[PDB]
């Protein structure tokens, strides 16, 4: 009934919350942690997917794509850039966290806000592989037995069935499973140190934050897998094999996580919580 607004609530949050996270890290100098530079990237990707919230909405109601190619080419790419940039940023966060608590001496030269921006730029280039290509191959095509307009990437019709199923697998495997694996390895090697080590760095304060931020990252990673696992096994079940509203539900979760992350940093960081309070409400 009133879902037409709760969809706008999330839309504003993910578009304002992430913009806020990006601006705070840019302007305020104290907020240039190696980890925060990664969150800037993640926020950026989340802001972009949030920009496609309306477009995906109108498709829900109308059921046919009514925009132009120039928008189908831009949304389809504003998407691949998000699917890859986000998961490659979490996987680096968790690796950055690994070499922060399981390699404290080497980290004295390996973890720096310049090195992190480099890995962030590197991630957008690797994501451009599939991201720029979507702008090229992105186009609209009238469905055959539907008489509706479809927006999707265009492949040579010679062996469509093959390259489709192969791409889907490589997406699921290399953008949903090899990344999660790395994180699970990262994080096991890490709680094993934290269950027995007395002090990770020289200060108790370093060790206070080293443990604390790694818990934030673990919660961000946790929310991500929970929201992103249903859609990934759904794109893969329909490939190897009907009034299925599951597709919009699994997209609902994925758009929740886009808007949930600005709030998670505000809740799981005493620094983000402090920078917001001294920005929105300067006492």
């Amino acid at each position: 009934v009133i879902i037409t607004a709760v969809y706008s609530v999330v839309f504003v949050v993910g578009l304002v919350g992430n913009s806020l996270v990006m601006f705070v890290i840019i302007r305020y100098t104290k907020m240039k942690t190696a980890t925060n530079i990664y969150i800037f990237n993640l926020a950026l990707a989340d802001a972009l997917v949030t920009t496609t919230m309306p477009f995906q909405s109108t498709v829900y109601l109308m059921n046919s794509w009514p925009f132009g190619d120039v928008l189908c080419k831009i949304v389809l790419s504003i998407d691949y850039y998000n699917m890859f940039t986000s998961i490659f940023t979490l996987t680096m966060m968790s690796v950055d966290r690994y070499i922060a608590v399981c390699h404290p001496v080497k980290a004295l030269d390996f973890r720096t806000p310049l090195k992190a921006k480099i890995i962030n730029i590197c991630i957008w280039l690797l994501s451009s592989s599939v991201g720029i290509s979507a702008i090229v191959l992105g186009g609209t095509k009238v469905r055959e037995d539907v008489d509706v307009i479809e927006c999707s990437l265009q492949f040579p019709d010679d062996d469509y069935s093959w390259w489709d199923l192969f791409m889907k697998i490589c997406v699921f495997i290399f953008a949903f499973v090899i990344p999660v694996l790395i994180i699970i390895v990262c994080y096991t090697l890490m709680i094993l140190r934290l269950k027995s080590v007395r002090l990770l760095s020289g200060s108790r304060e370093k060790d206070r934050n080293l443990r604390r931020i790694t818990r934030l990252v673990l919660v961000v990673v946790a929310v991500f897998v929970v929201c992103w696992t249903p859609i990934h096994i759904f794109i893969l079940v329909e490939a190897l094999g009907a009034a299925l509203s599951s597709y919009y539900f699994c997209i609902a979760l994925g758009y929740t996580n886009s808007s949930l992350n600005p709030i998670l940093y505000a809740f799981l960081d005493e620094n983000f919580k402090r920078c917001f309070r001294d920005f929105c409400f300067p006492l």
Epitope: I191, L194, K195, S196, R198, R204, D207, R208, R211
Partner: nanobody
Amino acid sequence: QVQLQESGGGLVQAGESLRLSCAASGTIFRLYDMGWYRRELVASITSGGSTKYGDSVKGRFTISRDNAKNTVYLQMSSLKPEDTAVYYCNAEYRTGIWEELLDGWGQGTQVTVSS
């Protein structure tokens, strides 16, 4: 959220021997270093039983640990009158795996050597 239980101080004549114990009780995840302070160090011991003694304790004191019972024991021997002070117990604990490293002090047990 940590309670310590101390014993074994009091009035004692010189060249007599005491024994202190300290029991770390509470809701904790893992204890790290237990030891006795007076505030300079007198004796401390890790989870792995490696001990460190103050300079004023020329082998006279010896500190054991029972990790099973979260208790540390200080065997003070050959007491001198220059040992009279308040002996504070110390217990490093962590309230959880992601949480901060912080210790808790004891009430203290008075030891007096005379004559």
